[PDB]
Amino acid sequence: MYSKIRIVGKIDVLTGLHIGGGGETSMIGAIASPVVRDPYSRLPIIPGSSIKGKMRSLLAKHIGLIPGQKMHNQDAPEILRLFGSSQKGAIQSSRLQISDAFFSKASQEEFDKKDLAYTETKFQIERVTRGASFDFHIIYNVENINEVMADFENIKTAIHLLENDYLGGGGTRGNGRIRFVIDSIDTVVGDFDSSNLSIK
Amino acid sequence: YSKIRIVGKIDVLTGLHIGGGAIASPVVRDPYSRLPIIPGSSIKGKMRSLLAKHIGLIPGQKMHNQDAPEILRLFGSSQKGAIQSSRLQISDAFFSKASQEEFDKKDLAYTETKFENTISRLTAVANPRQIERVTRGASFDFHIIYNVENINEVMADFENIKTAIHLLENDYLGGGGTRGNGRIRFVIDSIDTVVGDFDSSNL
Amino acid sequence: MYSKIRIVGKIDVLTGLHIGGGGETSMIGAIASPVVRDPYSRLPIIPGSSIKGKMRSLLAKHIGLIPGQKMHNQDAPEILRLFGSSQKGAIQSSRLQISDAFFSKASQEEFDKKDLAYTETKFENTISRLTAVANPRQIERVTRGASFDFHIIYNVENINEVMADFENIKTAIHLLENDYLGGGGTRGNGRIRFVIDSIDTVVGDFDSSNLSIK
Amino acid sequence: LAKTKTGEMIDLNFARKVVEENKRVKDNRGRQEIVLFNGLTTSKLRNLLELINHVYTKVYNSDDTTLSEDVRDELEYLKVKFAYESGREPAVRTFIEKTYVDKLVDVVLKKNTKKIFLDYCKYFEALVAYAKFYR
Amino acid sequence: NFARKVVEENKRVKDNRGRQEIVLFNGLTTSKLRNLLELINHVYTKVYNSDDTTLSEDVRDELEYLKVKFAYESGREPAVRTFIEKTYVDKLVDVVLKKNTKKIFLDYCKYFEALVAYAKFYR
Amino acid sequence: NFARKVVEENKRVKDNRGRQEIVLFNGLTTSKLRNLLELINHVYTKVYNSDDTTLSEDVRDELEYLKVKFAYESGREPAVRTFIEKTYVDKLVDVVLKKNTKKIFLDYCKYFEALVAYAKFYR
RNA sequence: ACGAGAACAUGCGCGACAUUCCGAAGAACGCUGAA
What we know:
This is part of a larger assembly, with three copies of chain A and three copies of chain D. Chain A has about 200 residues and is α+β, with helices and mostly antiparallel strands. Chain A is built from four helices and nine strands. With about 140 residues, chain D is mainly alpha-helical. In chain D, about 35% of the residues are buried. Chain B: Keywords: Antiviral defense, Endonuclease, Hydrolase, Nuclease, RNA-binding. Chain B: It is an enzyme of class 3 (hydrolase).
């Protein structure tokens, strides 16, 4: 049974988050760096590729990396099982489907109150305000029944690594700290049991 | 022999990339109106793959038409001697005029450029890349035809179709969907028996 | 009196239409499946045999096909009467003659404007069930804006059966619009719509003013 | 947008003409110094740009076509700050008097739309961009 | 064409540490022109999808803002501004506005694309 | 047989890898030429449709755009640059523009068709 | 007053079935609001 498990929750910023992206707008400030923004809502957005790449690199460095690597397809077999593998002759579809984390509407109302701008300027770069929150939604595709718990333990380890680390931008200079909160982890499709599944 | 029609809308919850022939990485666009389009081949392929995953899989289905018999009944088969006509006929989903007018009201382009740095391991030198995607909130009006080859099979076939749609709403539709792309949601307008006398009110 | 009723109209493609054929062109592309083209104009065409075959198959399936059918002459009597029969000793002429549908002048002008090509190259693939590797494929299609001038002749052999014949023709057209024309239609190609310009009895004293097919 | 005195129409080419008028050779020690608005420096015009972009951001937070009440209040505070900055520095006073920004923002308040505010701010952006270009 | 001659007059083969920079100007780079190229692509998509024989007012305002962006990138990168002086792109923008049709806009966009294409070809 | 001559002159084999593979124009494939050959197909259809011994103005402008496309493709891929320089195809485009007849463009299309056909042959 | 005269090379026929432009890829690093 190809069962699909869903993780939905929120990412609360802790510092001035900065994920860059090439774009221009009317009345753009003289700042040297704008933030990537969802074109439809013109709100700051966390691309899913950023979260996936950051967690992949964090897992690769924490588990132990083979010296002299030139390609991403040479990570640990568990990492290739989770985040995918394009290795020729050993193509593996990713069990992780991480989607773009949009600006949550609760934080949108909070920033509408008090006339707080979504993004501020630091002396210059543009950074997401601390009180902002982005709702994240990831999907785990069950391919092997026995390995789901191990994969979710690895996901929990990656979430913990990112929790104490930064997401894009000048994290070593104080831009990017975030925290993860989980609403529910339910087997949306299939008959797999995800009651005892947590990523934190 | 009756033809039941399933029209509705597909809403892109995230950016939708479906490749087609600086670093534009173009998305498939309808040549006439130059608007983004979801090919019906992509929808049918993703649905068939997801449903075949849901049902059991033989070790190597290298011929691609030796799936579970429900899959062959729904999406068609080509085995020698036993050619089963595909009951489902997905169609290319064009850019909805409602969503087109909604975007034109704003100063919004139908396609966004998303930047990905592709940072390396040993060198840690980012390699710029740009992916063209359909902007969030766009809608495509989709039209599916089901042919009732056998009357007794229709309820099971539509149960399988709804399972496929449920899987697809939990999956992406082309592009790098494993890192936040191609996510979609289906809203069904009207399932009505266009041709024939089959009772499509229940389904 | 021999009465021939002419049905002339447009065949609007609602999606990419790919009616394959042995193709030749300048700088032949990597495509192994080019559409059929009218060689004198090089524009894509809809062969009348494709329309007739698809309509006859759909109408025969609607009427119902005899179990264990080995030939097209074993169809229902209505199908043989309308589309013609070749049975030994029971040959019935085809009342329905479906000409080739040429690329319209209107679509040709609308594609000369906008600087658009009448055809397109859809890029597909096929994810294998074992190696999970995509094999790129290219299919030539006709863009969804194009329309084709279609011309059909109905032969009035029996006067009293004309209304039933046109009911069957209307059923066939209605099935075909919901179905696809010749192509990879189960994957979205070949969607079609008929827009009947006129139905006039070109020959004979018969009148088809009340007669409609859509 | 708005109509200047003597029948001039506020446009971006009008901003180009104004900044061309404001510039002088200012040859010192045999070398020219490009002076804009009585020698207005880049820092102060960029501070004015930041003041404008504050209102820009606070109005882009809203999807409403008309100006929000707090947006209008911030524009009034912008008028007050423009007056005081004109008072403090003769260069800023020359800039404000040659750009009619207070009159333009008053017209924007009367019109009460996002598009007119965007047009006025585009005129201001053209002013600052041409000022940095001619320097 | 005009673009090829302009670029080949612009191009220069500088020698640094034995390596050769076959570059129009020292500061010229694909991204610095590419910003204006992105704006041009947006407005070109607007006109090329709207299908109007006369340029729409919103497109005209976009071209005015395009002149503003010309001035802004002139202020930031001197290489971009000397390229603009060499290529007279702003003058072509003015001509396009005066004609107020889509045909002249398409020709001007093709001219700009030829400029960037020749720049890539030589570089 | 200029086409076969240039293809066989530029024909090469991957001896360095030690595994047999035929390399044309230092790695050219039909995928590299796809855009420009589709553009030439567009011009060929346009000229075939028109009944005129000399090329029309739209044909001439499209051929100038084809020259620009040749330059851009040369810039993007080294293989297309090698193919264009060795085959002198852009110089033949200039010659066609000089001649300004339908027959000369038909012969240019024949030459390009022979080029791509022989390239596919010797692969 | 022609080895002649009368005699449709015609009748039925979908270039059609099966096929996800996909698998991976952080907008990036080191950059004091300061003499």
